[PDB]
């Protein structure tokens, strides 16, 4: 919306930056049993047939 | 507005001085569990992860 002032648009920008940093952090930090899941493009393989 | 007399400016100055002193007070004081939160410019660090 074009009605808000830039002084208040800056706060929305800071909130957006904070949420983007959270996206980065949760993408980089979460790992299951010593192996990451969102930091690589590799494919897992689950032996299910003996 | 300039309609106020100097005597009234003295009273309003006393009031704003008291307000500023209270601001300094609440600034220096108001710790949380032994550690102050508004007297030091550093960054507090908290971890979430194993």
Cβ–Cβ under 8 Å, residues A44 and A32: no
DSSP A1-50: -TTS-HHHHHHHHHHHHHHHHHHHHHHHH-EETTEESSS-----------
Dist. CA B21–CA B10, nearest whole Å: 16
Method of elucidation? cryo-EM
Cβ–Cβ under 8 Å, residues B35 and B44: no
Dist. CA A2–CA B9, nearest whole Å: 41
The Cα-based distances of B1 to B4, B8, B16 in angstroms read 7, 12, 16
Q: Shortest CA distance to B37 belongs to which of B47, B27, B23?
A: B27
Token code pair at residue A37: 């899941």
Dist. CA A15–CA B12, nearest whole Å: 38
Dist. CA B9–CA B17, nearest whole Å: 12
Cβ–Cβ under 8 Å, residues A37 and A31: yes
Q: How many CB atoms within 10 Å of residue A45?
A: 6
Scanning the structure block, which residue is given the tokens 């005597």? B7
Token code pair at residue B30: 């108001």
């Amino acid at each position: 919306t074009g009605t808000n002032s830039d002084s208040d648009l800056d706060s929305i920008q800071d909130e957006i930056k904070s949420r983007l940093d959270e996206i980065d952090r949760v993408s980089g930090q979460t790992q299951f049993n010593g192996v990451n899941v969102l930091a690589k493009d590799g494919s897992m393989k689950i032996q299910v047939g003996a």
